[PDB]
Design a protein around this nucleic acid. Structure first.
Ligand SMILES: [Zn+2]
Length: 665
DNA sequence: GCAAGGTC
């Protein structure tokens, strides 16, 4: 049988598609084999050496520690021996273990990042011979990249491996201990056993939602005033908002008074042609943001649809931060694949506006292991509309990036009020060449109605208004805008961000208020408890500091052992200081879950704090009265008018509106 | 039991 083979080198890939692609790169007829119901590949013909290519399935090993508190040591163990979720990995473990027995040497061909180095290391270490190990380094999954990596096989980068291991240790230490400190404190106080968690990523994310929700529910809009004018010039009546703001309504009224009756004169005309840049290809964060804005799909669902499309061979590997396509990726093969599909009409358009040359508009962000998300060229069949909407975004985004920047004709009129130092512009845009706007057609570009003015034309300011504008709070969070905030803060990875948000929901820390996501009462107190006794775990700075130490490990500037001991010092010091207050923590937690029931606020479910009000409803009144004074000085309105306008604004925090409502009776 | 991180 063809699948019998001896004296080969064992090439370990991170996933089954990567293994297949490597096998296809090294032989034109690689041998498909099957054992423990896992596919693997034999190469009998690559330059007179034998190779077996076997996929892992993500991590096959994970840290495992003792039970109890606190625990400052853990061991790598088979994931299936500890986690019944990842029982899926056992058959991969068994296959690789079997194949390692006859192998002459081992090559880690997992993805070229910190986690890939660890996955392959632990597999070779525990199932193979780490003394006979080498590394394959490729940043894309093309034959050229793979065969070049294969030719340039090097020794293991232990600095990269140790950074990866350090990341696991740090996250295990803080995640497990602090999560246990939460559960153990409640257990000793309330004699209740509930699942509570904290972590380097999930907890700064919870606190962000909680802090924003607090400031928002306490927000009072403050008033400012701007002036708009009516300009009669020739057949035209122009309504112009003057770029000047006023705190006091009286100085806005004096400004408007000084503009009315004055003459305005066109002093400059500029006809300029602007290029509107075509988009770059998607990274997962861009795709999540766009799919959210255009279709309302949640970032966790976008991640899993993108995965299904990639498992179907329709798009490249989606868990990528890159917005770049490297030169080893055949654009021609994608375009001609998309020609043999329903997109051929758009391809013909791209071929037209480019003169037949497809140049990717390379984005800024990179990824060491993968290029940006792009269609493979394979034509889809039987995509439910939800999976087609994602595929179409990716394909039109890629096709748009290989097309042409759009051309805009801007007519800009500079008008000056004669007898006053005030200039202001009036402009309309007309789209010369839509170009990518017809391909990635998810961008509305406003073409105003043309206005024909000439240098020397004059008009009168015949009217105007003082316009009030009320200040605005921070916006509410959606799952996608939270995703965006995490990426912006460098929390999580393309894979974990969606999932970690869903963890915060499953722990009942956050919940869905329709479109939005809002903290629960449990979430509120967990943020407070964690900021009080474990503030490091609640700041995005912990990830920044950890990333910095990890880059030092990767570059030979520090030892993993130091970083872990330092981490243990900080955690333990908090652990010591914690288990004195550990019954207050359980107490706060007991209140958090509604076990210590309490006297409720006059207006909500929170615990009353002063004058019959919870601490936030009390602060809402303090802040309201301060604001009401500011409104008085600025607007000259009477008290009832101020309240009723504050009660009218969607910007007004809920807690404030409860008090205003009451003040109005 | 709990993290964050791979992938299924
Ligand atoms: Zn209250």
């Amino acid at each position: 049988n063809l699948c019998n083979v001896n004296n080969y080198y064992l090439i370990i890939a991170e996933k089954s598609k990567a293994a297949k692609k490597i096998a296809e790169a090294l032989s034109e007829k690689p041998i498909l084999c099957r054992k423990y119901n896992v596919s693997y590949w034999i190469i009998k013909d690559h330059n007179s050496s034998k190779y077996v290519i076997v996929p892992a399935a993500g991590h096959l090993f994970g840290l495992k520690g003792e039970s109890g508190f606190p625990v400052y040591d853990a061991d790598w163990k088979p994931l299936w021996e500890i986690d019944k979720n990842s029982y899926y990995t056992k058959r991969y473990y068994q296959l690789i273990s079997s194949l390692s027995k006859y192998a002459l040497g081992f090559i880690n061909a997992c993805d070229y990042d910190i986690e890939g180095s660890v996955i392959g290391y632990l597999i070779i270490k525990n199932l193979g011979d780490i003394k006979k190990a080498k590394r394959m380094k490729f940043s894309a999954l093309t034959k050229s990249d793979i065969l070049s990596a294969f030719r340039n096989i090097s020794a293991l980068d232990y600095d990269m491996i140790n950074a990866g291991i350090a990341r696991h240790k740090i996250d295990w230490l803080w995640g497990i201990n602090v999560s246990r400190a939460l559960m153990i404190s409640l257990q000793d106080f309330a004699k209740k056993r509930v699942i509570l968690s904290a972590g380097r990523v999930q907890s700064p994310t919870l606190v962000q939602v909680v802090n924003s929700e607090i400031e928002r529910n306490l927000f009072i809009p403050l008033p400012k005033f701007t002036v708009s004018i009516i300009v009669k010039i020739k057949d035209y009546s122009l309504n112009i908002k003057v770029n000047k703001e006023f705190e006091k309504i009286t100085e806005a009224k004096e400004f408007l008074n000084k503009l009315i009756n004055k003459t305005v004169k066109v002093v400059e005309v500029e006809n300029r042609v602007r290029l509107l840049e075509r988009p770059s290809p998607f990274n997962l964060t861009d795709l999540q943001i766009e799919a959210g804005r255009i279709y309302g799909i949640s970032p966790y669902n976008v991640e899993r649809i993108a995965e299904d499309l990639y498992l179907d061979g329709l798009i490249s590997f989606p868990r990528t931060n890159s917005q770049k396509i490297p030169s080893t990726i055949s654009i021609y093969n994608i375009i001609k694949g998309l020609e043999n599909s329903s997109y051929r009409k758009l391809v013909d358009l791209v071929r037209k506006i480019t003169g037949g040359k497809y140049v990717v508009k390379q984005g800024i962000k990179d990824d060491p292991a993968h290029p940006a998300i792009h269609p493979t060229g394979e034509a889809p069949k039987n995509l439910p509309n939800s999976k087609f909407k994602i595929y179409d975004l990716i394909a039109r985004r890629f096709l748009g990036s290989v097309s042409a920047d759009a051309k805009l004709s801007n007519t800009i009129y500079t008008l000056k009020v004669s007898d006053f130092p005030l200039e202001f512009t009036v402009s309309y845009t007309k789209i010369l060449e839509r170009n990518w706007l017809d391909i990635y057609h998810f961008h509305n570009v406003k073409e105003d109605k043309p206005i024909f003015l000439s240098k020397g034309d004059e008009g009168k300011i015949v009217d105007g208004k003082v316009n009030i504008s009320l200040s605005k709070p921070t916006s509410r969070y959606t799952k996608v805008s939270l995703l965006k905030w995490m990426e912006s803060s460098n929390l999580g990875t393309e894979a974990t961000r969606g999932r970690i948000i869903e963890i915060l929901v499953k722990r009942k820390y956050l919940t869905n208020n329709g479109r939005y996501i809002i903290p629960t009462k449990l979430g509120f107190y967990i943020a407070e408890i964690l900021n009080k006794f474990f503030p490091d775990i609640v700041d995005v700075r912990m990830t920044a500091d950890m990333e910095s130490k990890l880059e030092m490990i990767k570059t030979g500037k520090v030892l993993e052992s130091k970083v872990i001991k330092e981490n243990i010092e900080k955690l333990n010091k908090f652990i010591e200081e914690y288990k004195v207050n550990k019954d207050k923590v359980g107490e706060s937690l007991a209140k958090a879950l509604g076990l210590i029931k309490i006297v409720k606020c006059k207006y909500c479910d929170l615990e009353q704090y002063k004058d019959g009000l919870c601490k936030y409803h009390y602060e809402a009144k303090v802040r309201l009265l301060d604001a009401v004074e500011i409104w008085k000085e600025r607007t000259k309105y009477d008290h009832k008018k101020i309240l009723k306008r504050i009660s009218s604004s969607k910007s007004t925090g809920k807690y404030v509106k409860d008090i205003v409502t009451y003040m109005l009776s």
